[PDB]
Amino acid sequence: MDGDEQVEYPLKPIVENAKPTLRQIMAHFSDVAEAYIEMRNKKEPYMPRYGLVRNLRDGSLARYAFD
Amino acid sequence: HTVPRIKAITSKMRMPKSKGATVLNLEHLLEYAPQQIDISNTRATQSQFDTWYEAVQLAYDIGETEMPTVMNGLMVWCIENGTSPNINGVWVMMDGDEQVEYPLKPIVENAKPTLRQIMAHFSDVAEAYIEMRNKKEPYMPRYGLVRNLRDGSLARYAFDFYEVTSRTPVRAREAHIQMKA
Amino acid sequence: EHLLEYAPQQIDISNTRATQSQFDTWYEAVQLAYDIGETEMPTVMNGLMVWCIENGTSPNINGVWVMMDGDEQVEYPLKPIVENAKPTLRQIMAHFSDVAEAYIEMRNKKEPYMPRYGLVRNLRDGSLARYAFD
């Protein structure tokens, strides 16, 4: 995102050089993601789309609701 | 804070070149857009069709004001039969429940390269004639009739000298695969 | 040593494209046979690619190919073109294969354009037509 416009990047290099799996390597960011979600939830009701569409409804828990 | 955008690499096109000089003329190429109907290996060139049409006129010895009638029956005759008949023989037309015949030697001998590849000029019109006939009776050309085919509506695309372009329906386009198998 | 910097383009070392010498002989020999000035031959080859898109690349040795001047036909003998093409007309005219994509895309931007080869090859896809010549 650059000021209400979209820039795109190819996804082939990202999801192909991720051994063993993208989940098991991007989990390095899982610790920081809590800080980002908490910061966002301090200005608006923020809920990640994963736990959003997982029958879940709790708000405060949203800090722990990504894949 | 410029959020780097993946740089775009434009793979430069490779013009054919001889002795360090481009062969294609890029200018003329940008407006050289002829009809698909024109540049084909099926249809005969306008010169070859002109020679055939003129040579047939001299052999039959018929006035140019009346020849349109003669060629009017030539297309109809060639729909009902093939486009590679016997060199020696006749084709039949019609004046009120009687037959008039014309020798077939001049027609099938001055047709370069082949009678199919030169009579295909009539292939566009033949669709209009067949559709008109099918609007009053179940009409089927004898070629697709005896080619294991049974479809009725398709009959507009079931003669021997049919040429195929980009505007033929897929049902018509896939049909010629099976008949010409 | 040399192997660490010997990195030529893939376009160059192929068994499909003809060598620059063989393409040079064909382009020069056709010029002598047709007897056309080098300043005007670009026009002639401009229609040769378009003609070979609409048909195959293995036609009859004896015959003609058609070009166009304002709804009229001009023909050129096909014997010199298909006889001085070593090893084969397909393997030497493939120099034009890169440009042909640009021409087809330009045509398809104004009408539904499909080369007659892929047209009569059981194929039906439209956007793919940029990659459907012989």
Numbering used by the authors:
A (entry chain Aj): 135 to 201
B (entry chain Aa): 42 to 222
C (entry chain Ab): 68 to 201
The authors write:
Potyviral CP plays a role in virtually every step of the viral infection cycle, from transmission of the virion by aphids, virus assembly and disassembly, regulation of genome amplification, protein translation, to cell-to-cell and long-distance movement. CP consists of a highly conserved globular core flanked by two large extended regions with a high frequency of structural disorder. The C-terminal high intrinsic disorder region (C-IDR) is partially conserved and packaged in the lumen of the virion, supported by the helical ssRNA scaffold. Here, we show that we can control the shape, size, RNA encapsidation ability, symmetry, stability and surface functionalization of nanoparticles through structure-based design of CP from potato virus Y (PVY).
